[PDB]
Amino acid sequence: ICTAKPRDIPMNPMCIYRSPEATNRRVWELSKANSRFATTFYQHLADSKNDNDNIFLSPLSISTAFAMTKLGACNDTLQQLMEVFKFDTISEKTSDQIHFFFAKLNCRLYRKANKSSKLVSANRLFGDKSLTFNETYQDISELVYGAKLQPLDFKENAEQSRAAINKWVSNKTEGRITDVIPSEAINELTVLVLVNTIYFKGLWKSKFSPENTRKELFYKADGESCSASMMYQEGKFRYRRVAEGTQVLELPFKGDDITMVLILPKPEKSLAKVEKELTPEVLQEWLDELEEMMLVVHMPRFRIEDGFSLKEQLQDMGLVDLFSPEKSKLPGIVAEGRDDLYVSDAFHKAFLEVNEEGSEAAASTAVVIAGRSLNPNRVTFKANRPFLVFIREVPLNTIIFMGRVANPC
Ligand SMILES: *[C@@H]1O[C@H](CO)[C@@H](O[C@@H]2O[C@H](CO)[C@@H](O)[C@H](O)[C@H]2NC(C)=O)[C@H](O)[C@H]1NC(C)=O
Ligand SMILES: *[C@@H]1O[C@H](CO)[C@@H](O[C@@H]2O[C@H](CO)[C@@H](O)[C@H](O)[C@H]2NC(C)=O)[C@H](O)[C@H]1NC(C)=O
Ligand SMILES: *[C@@H]1O[C@H](CO)[C@@H](O)[C@H](O)[C@H]1NC(C)=O
Numbered sequence: 001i002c003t004a005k006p007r008d009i010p011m012n013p014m015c016i017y018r019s020p021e022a023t024n025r026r027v028w029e030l031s032k033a034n035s036r037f038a039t040t041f042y043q044h045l046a047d048s049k050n051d052n053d054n055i056f057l058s059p060l061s062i063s064t065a066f067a068m069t070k071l072g073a074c075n076d077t078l079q080q081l082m083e084v085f086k087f088d089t090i091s092e093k094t095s096d097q098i099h100f101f102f103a104k105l106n107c108r109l110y111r112k113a114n115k116s117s118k119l120v121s122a123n124r125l126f127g128d129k130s131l132t133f134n135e136t137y138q139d140i141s142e143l144v145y146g147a148k149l150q151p152l153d154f155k156e157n158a159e160q161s162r163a164a165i166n167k168w169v170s171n172k173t174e175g176r177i178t179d180v181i182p183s184e185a186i187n188e189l190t191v192l193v194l195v196n197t198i199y200f201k202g203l204w205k206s207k208f209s210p211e212n213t214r215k216e217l218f219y220k221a222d223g224e225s226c227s228a229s230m231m232y233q234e235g236k237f238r239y240r241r242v243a244e245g246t247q248v249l250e251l252p253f254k255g256d257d258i259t260m261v262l263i264l265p266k267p268e269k270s271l272a273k274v275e276k277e278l279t280p281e282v283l284q285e286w287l288d289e290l291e292e293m294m295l296v297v298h299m300p301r302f303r304i305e306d307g308f309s310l311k312e313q314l315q316d317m318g319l320v321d322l323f324s325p326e327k328s329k330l331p332g333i334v335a336e337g338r339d340d341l342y343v344s345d346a347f348h349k350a351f352l353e354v355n356e357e358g359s360e361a362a363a364s365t366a367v368v369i370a371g372r373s374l375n376p377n378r379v380t381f382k383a384n385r386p387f388l389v390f391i392r393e394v395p396l397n398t399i400i401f402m403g404r405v406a407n408p409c
């Protein structure tokens with residue numbers, strides 16, 4: 001329940017970790033944590049992609065999914081989830097309290113009176129049909145994050161539950177996110193699949209007239225060309241031309257609660273060095289340094305889609321135990337304490353759509369317990385002069401989506 005207080009809800013999983021208003025000051029602290037994850041996760045992910053191909057994700061989506069996972073985690077595994085997703089940065093000595101505020105942060109995001117921009121979230125546990133999931137686990141999940149445990153047959157019809165999960169996410173994100181879990185990563189041994197969903201749709205505060213949109217040619221690094229639909233408009237915007245001639249433009253959505261932030265550097269320089277210096281502090285320097293201004297905005301009318309596995313990068317960031325069969329401690333999920341429970345692979349999938357009327361983003365993260373850990377299916381071409389995008393929620397300090405547009409064709 002959103003309407004709640006510290007002691008009221010006894011949200012106590014199996015293992016506690018001790019890291020060496022009040023609620024509002026902690027809800028903010030968790031937002032700080034989320035973005036340090038976002039930033040660092042972004043950086044690691046960028047190394048595994050080219051400089052010229054698109055990148056799109058919801059770092060908040062990922063954070064949430066792994067927080068759901070956390071509830072059944074223990075020992076080393078628990079500790080590492082706290083560190084990697086910067087949840088040990090918050091105040092509370094106890095690690096079962098992180099979830100309290102996470103739910104509260106999720107209450108201010110997905111429930112308001114200010115219904116200008118639609119920003120919805122769904123969570124769902126998909127456990128094996130025959131198994132026995134812990135009673136307390138079940139109700140912490142369902143209470144704190146709203147994740148009901150839908151029984152599915154992983155044992156017999158593995159590949160129909162794989163497509164049932166895909167279809168559930170699919171329904172929850174308006175048709176935009178469908179292929180969350182790559183076809184064959186859930187086998188007979190798969191026990192559980194934890195899923196998160198975020199869906200956004202804003203309308204520009206000051207939209208672009210369709211009349212002024214003109215096709216121009218875009219030239220990819222390859223040495224090829226492609227048409228691109230450029231939009232246009234003049235108006236009063238929060239803008240700034242920061243150090244090294246980098247431009248930071250903010251296009252707010254009806255309401256000013258959620259705004260998009262563009263970031264493009266001077267043509268002679270790359271994005272790479274701006275990418276490499278990105279932190280949650282730097283980003284805030286830029287935002288606080290923004291003044292209003294009459295300016296001409298030329299932004300493409302485009303769509304990008306990005307889907308990948310988080311294993312690699314997450315292991316690089318510090319998530320070692322959770323993915324390993326022998327050391328992964330998750331004994332708070334099933335009946336006795338099946339120690340087997342280890343994560344095979346985790347998948348993310350995002351969609352960004354920008355046009356004259358507004359923007360539409362959507363994403364899904366899924367942690368899969370005990371299936372197959374396949375190699376990722378990623379077919380992308382690379383084109384030039386990319387720009388960073390960020391869809392943020394102002395008041396709550398959270399980065400809903402974030403990405404790099406490098407090809408509007
Ligand atoms: C499900 O997990 C809970 C923890 O959330 C386990 O309950 C603990 O059990 C011991 C002994 O019965 C108590 O001392 C603790 O207070 C209990 N709760 C907590 C929060 O630790 C429970 O054992 C698990 N159930 C099954 C069937 O495994
Ligand atoms: C995994 O972590 C739990 C603690 O979270 C360890 O169990 C505790 O062991 C100490 C003494 O050895 C007891 O005083 C506690 O009551 C135990 N339980 C809990 C819930 O705290 C366990 O030893 C750890 N180690 C391994 C290797 O599993
Ligand atoms: C999702 O299912 C609900 C029924 O609970 C339905 O109202 C909605 O239209 C469905 N949406 C999609 C995109 O499938």
